[PDB]
Design a binder for this molecule. Structure first.
Ligand SMILES: [Zn+2]
Lengths: 90, 4
Protein backbone atom coordinates (compact mmCIF):
# COMPACT_ATOMS: atom_id res chain seq x y z
CA UNK A 1 0.00 0.00 0.00
CA UNK A 2 0.96 3.68 -0.30
CA UNK A 3 3.32 5.32 2.20
CA UNK A 4 0.97 8.33 2.37
CA UNK A 5 -2.57 7.28 1.33
CA UNK A 6 -3.96 10.80 1.95
CA UNK A 7 -2.11 12.09 -1.13
CA UNK A 8 -3.36 9.27 -3.39
CA UNK A 9 -5.74 11.67 -5.17
CA UNK A 10 -4.19 13.45 -8.17
CA UNK A 11 -6.47 16.43 -7.53
CA UNK A 12 -5.19 16.83 -3.96
CA UNK A 13 -1.61 16.56 -5.22
CA UNK A 14 -2.24 19.25 -7.84
CA UNK A 15 -3.76 21.57 -5.22
CA UNK A 16 -0.56 21.29 -3.17
CA UNK A 17 1.34 23.17 -5.92
CA UNK A 18 -0.47 26.51 -5.40
CA UNK A 19 2.83 28.25 -4.50
CA UNK A 20 5.16 26.16 -6.71
CA UNK A 21 8.14 28.34 -7.75
CA UNK A 22 8.84 26.63 -11.12
CA UNK A 23 5.53 26.66 -13.03
CA UNK A 24 6.99 27.18 -16.53
CA UNK A 25 10.04 25.01 -15.89
CA UNK A 26 8.28 21.90 -14.52
CA UNK A 27 4.45 22.00 -14.69
CA UNK A 28 2.50 21.12 -11.51
CA UNK A 29 0.10 19.16 -13.74
CA UNK A 30 2.89 16.76 -14.75
CA UNK A 31 4.31 16.55 -11.22
CA UNK A 32 0.90 15.68 -9.72
CA UNK A 33 0.17 13.16 -12.47
CA UNK A 34 3.52 11.44 -11.68
CA UNK A 35 2.56 10.92 -8.02
CA UNK A 36 4.25 13.99 -6.51
CA UNK A 37 2.94 16.65 -4.12
CA UNK A 38 4.69 19.88 -3.11
CA UNK A 39 6.06 19.90 0.45
CA UNK A 40 5.77 23.71 0.46
CA UNK A 41 9.53 24.11 0.98
CA UNK A 42 11.70 25.27 -1.93
CA UNK A 43 11.07 22.90 -4.88
CA UNK A 44 10.97 19.77 -2.72
CA UNK A 45 8.31 17.27 -3.80
CA UNK A 46 7.47 13.76 -2.63
CA UNK A 47 5.69 10.74 -4.10
CA UNK A 48 2.62 9.69 -2.10
CA UNK A 49 3.28 6.01 -2.77
CA UNK A 50 7.02 5.36 -2.31
CA UNK A 51 7.64 8.55 -0.24
CA UNK A 52 10.66 9.31 -2.43
CA UNK A 53 11.59 13.00 -2.34
CA UNK A 54 13.06 15.02 -5.22
CA UNK A 55 14.40 18.59 -5.28
CA UNK A 56 16.64 20.85 -7.41
CA UNK A 57 14.40 20.53 -10.47
CA UNK A 58 15.97 21.77 -13.71
CA UNK A 59 14.03 23.35 -16.56
CA UNK A 60 12.41 20.70 -18.74
CA UNK A 61 12.99 17.84 -16.26
CA UNK A 62 10.22 15.29 -16.85
CA UNK A 63 8.53 14.14 -13.60
CA UNK A 64 7.83 10.55 -14.73
CA UNK A 65 11.41 10.20 -16.04
CA UNK A 66 12.87 11.42 -12.72
CA UNK A 67 10.47 9.14 -10.79
CA UNK A 68 11.75 6.14 -12.75
CA UNK A 69 15.40 7.26 -12.56
CA UNK A 70 15.55 7.58 -8.77
CA UNK A 71 12.75 5.29 -7.49
CA UNK A 72 12.38 2.44 -10.02
CA UNK A 73 10.82 0.13 -7.38
CA UNK A 74 7.78 2.39 -6.81
CA UNK A 75 4.58 0.40 -7.38
CA UNK A 76 2.59 3.49 -8.35
CA UNK A 77 5.19 4.17 -11.05
CA UNK A 78 4.99 0.52 -12.18
CA UNK A 79 1.17 0.43 -12.26
CA UNK A 80 0.96 3.75 -14.12
CA UNK A 81 3.82 3.48 -16.62
CA UNK A 82 4.70 -0.24 -16.88
CA UNK A 83 7.98 -2.11 -16.58
CA UNK A 84 9.19 -1.45 -20.15
CA UNK A 85 9.15 2.32 -19.51
CA UNK A 86 11.20 1.92 -16.30
CA UNK A 87 13.69 -0.46 -17.97
CA UNK A 88 14.23 1.91 -20.90
CA UNK A 89 15.13 4.83 -18.61
CA UNK A 90 17.84 2.63 -17.08
CA UNK B 1 16.29 16.54 -10.11
CA UNK B 2 17.97 14.75 -7.20
CA UNK B 3 16.77 12.93 -4.05
CA UNK B 4 16.72 14.52 -0.56
ZN1 LIG C 1 6.89 6.76 -6.14
Amino acid sequence: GPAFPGMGSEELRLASFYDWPLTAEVPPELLAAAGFFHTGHQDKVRCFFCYGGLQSWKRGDDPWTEHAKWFPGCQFLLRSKGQEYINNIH
Amino acid sequence: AVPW
